[PDB]
């Protein structure tokens, strides 16, 4: 006696019991109700568009400092302001204010990095294989 | 004969103005680039890309990209279809880098 | 002067006679600030024995 029915004709209860208990899982609940993407940083998207508001570390005396590579960006989808990392100060250059930037998941609290500016990859500009259209 | 701007009726409610930029002048390539709503970029297919083609694109990229359409010309000069098709491929993909 | 964020490009030769074959676009940039004075300085070193 394991606290469960075992009769050969008790298939019904085992199913009904299983369906009820399956809702206990958070993973099962999120998958069925489609609320798993609330927790995602971009609300289910793989990348985030934004506007460059300011370059916080532009002044910072120390080259290639963690502050220098941070840029404040406002997400277009919701308008919430966040920070993004830039690969390096040279890449901090191609970014200028009011440019469109595509963001991707990555000083603590900065969880985003810039992968495109003005519709072109930052690495492409950094390797200098392309030129930013304005 | 065509000289200077030519305005033509193009639709029920749409009109176009054609301008043939002087090919030999850079100073021309700059100021047309600042006002051209559409660019018909002519490329010699047999010869391939040239300087003045590339420079104007760079002028456009810095002063605001307008609509750019690549037009390949002198394709009849090719003698084989294989090289014609293959040549078209590089010219397109290289055009896809700038635009 | 011009408003900030105005992009520009630079060329060294505009005459056909000196065209050569090299690329004629020399520099590209974005104007950052407008002012009526600047204080550019350079390193001057005095040497003694």
């Amino acid at each position: 006696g394991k606290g469960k029915p075992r009769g050969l004709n008790s298939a019904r209860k085992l199913r009904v019991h299983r369906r009820n208990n399956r809702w206990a899982e958070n993973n099962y609940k999120k998958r069925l109700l489609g609320t798993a993407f609330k927790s995602s940083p971009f609300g289910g998207s793989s990348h985030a568009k934004g506007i460059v508001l300011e370059k916080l570390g532009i002044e910072s005396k120390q080259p290639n400092s963690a502050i220098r590579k941070c840029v404040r960006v406002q997400l277009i989808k919701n308008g919430k302001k966040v920070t993004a990392f830039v690969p390096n100060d040279g890449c901090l250059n191609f970014v200028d204010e009011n440019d469109e930037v595509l963001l991707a998941g990555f000083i603590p609290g900065v969880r985003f990095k810039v992968v495109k500016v003005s519709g072109v990859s930052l690495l492409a500009l950094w390797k200098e294989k392309k030129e930013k259209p304005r | 004969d065509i000289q200077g701007p030519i305005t033509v009726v193009s639709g029920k409610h749409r009109r176009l103005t054609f301008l043939e930029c002087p090919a030999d002048d850079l100073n021309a390539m700059i100021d047309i680039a600042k006002i051209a709503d559409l660019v018909l970029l002519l490329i010699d297919g047999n010869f391939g890309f040239e300087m003045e083609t590339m420079e104007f694109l760079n002028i456009a990229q810095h002063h605001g990209m307008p609509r750019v359409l690549g037009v390949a010309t002198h394709l009849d000069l090719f003698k084989s279809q294989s090289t014609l098709r293959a040549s078209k491929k590089r010219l397109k993909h290289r055009f896809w880098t700038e635009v | 002067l011009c408003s900030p964020n105005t992009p520009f490009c630079g060329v060294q030769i505009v005459a056909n006679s000196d065209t050569g074959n090299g690329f004629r676009i020399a520099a590209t940039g974005i104007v950052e600030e407008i002012d009526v004075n600047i204080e550019i300085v350079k390193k001057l070193k005095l040497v003694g024995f």
């Binding site: 390797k127 200098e128 | 010869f47 391939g48 300087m51 590339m54 | 074959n21 690329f23």
Partner: peptide, 25 residues
């Protein structure tokens, strides 16, 4: 009369680190 594009323009390899010949094969 025609100014053709040079090697740097055509390939657009850009800035890349030096890579040993052995990687080619």
């Amino acid at each position: 009369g025609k100014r053709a594009i040079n090697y740097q323009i055509l390939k657009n390899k850009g800035l890349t680190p030096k890579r040993n010949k052995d990687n080619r094969n």
